[PDB]
């Protein structure tokens, strides 16, 4: 993720 997002 570009930051905090999908875990993988």
């Amino acid at each position: 993720a570009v930051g905090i997002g999908a875990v993988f």
Partner: antibody, heavy 121, light 110 residues
Framework: VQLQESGPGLVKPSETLSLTCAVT?????????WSWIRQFPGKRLEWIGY????????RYNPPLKNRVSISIDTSKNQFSLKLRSVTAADTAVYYC??????????????WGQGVLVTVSS | FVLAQPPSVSGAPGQRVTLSCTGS????????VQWYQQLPGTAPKLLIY???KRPSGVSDRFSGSQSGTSASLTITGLQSEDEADYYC???????????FGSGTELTVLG
């Protein structure tokens, strides 16, 4: 493009912290993750949870799952946080954040300005 | 703190410094590492994502790397305007949460 948390304030112990983040320059329904992240006095950062714009699915930091709810409002293009049964331990700066566009010249993720919520009698 | 960081690291101007982030096999070993910079009074800013990618507008003196259960932020040609707090960030499978490191305070000497 731009995220703005609601106004700062006082919450009495045991009551419910309630925040909203107004989004402009993009749709709250886009395929992005809308997070709440707080920073305590002492500078420790904690991820509270997020809601996915496209589905409304949520994930919460497991210790908080019984206290927290994150929601989306399409009419106002905004998302919100509710943290109940709050105590002085929840005094912190609260940020709304969205993950960045996945292209090579991305600017990064997008953070609000943060809003101080202080829990006090 | 599941990601341990040196509380303070200092360097002389123009030098190269490395900020460390020590994790476990339930986070840095398996999931991407992000690096955030926080200047006084401001929100954290994404410097590195996915172990080693740099967004447009972050100076190329910053670079990220990962190996095993450890990750690193590297600053070349150190400048005074790099004094800030630096946090690493990763996802922890056993806690099921996105987590932040304890933070490293960087001071530019002299």
């Amino acid at each position: 493009v731009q995220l703005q948390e609601s106004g700062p304030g006082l919450v009495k112990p045991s009551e419910t912290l309630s925040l909203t983040c107004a989004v402009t320059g993009g749709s709250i329904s886009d395929a992005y993750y809308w997070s709440w992240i707080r920073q305590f006095p002492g500078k420790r950062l904690e991820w509270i949870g997020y809601i996915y714009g496209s589905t409304g699915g949520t994930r919460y930091n497991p210790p908080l799952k019984n206290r927290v709810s994150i929601s989306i409002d399409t009419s106002k293009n905004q998302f919100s946080l509710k943290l109940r049964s709050v105590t002085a331990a929840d005094t912190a700066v609260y940020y709304c954040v969205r993950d960045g566009v996945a292209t090579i010249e991305t600017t990064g993720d997008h953070w609000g300005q943060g809003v101080l919520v202080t829990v006090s009698s | 703190f599941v990601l341990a960081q040196p509380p303070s690291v200092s360097g002389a101007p123009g030098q190269r410094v490395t900020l460390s982030c020590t994790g476990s096999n339930s986070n840095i070993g398996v999931n991407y590492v992000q690096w955030y910079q926080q200047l006084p009074g401001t929100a954290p800013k994404l410097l590195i994502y996915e172990n080693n990618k740099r967004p447009s507008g972050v100076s190329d003196r910053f670079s990220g790397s990962q190996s095993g259960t450890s990750a690193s932020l590297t600053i070349t040609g150190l400048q005074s305007e790099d004094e800030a707090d630096y946090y690493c960030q990763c996802y922890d499978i056993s806690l099921g949460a996105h987590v932040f490191g304890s933070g490293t305070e960087l001071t530019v000497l002299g």
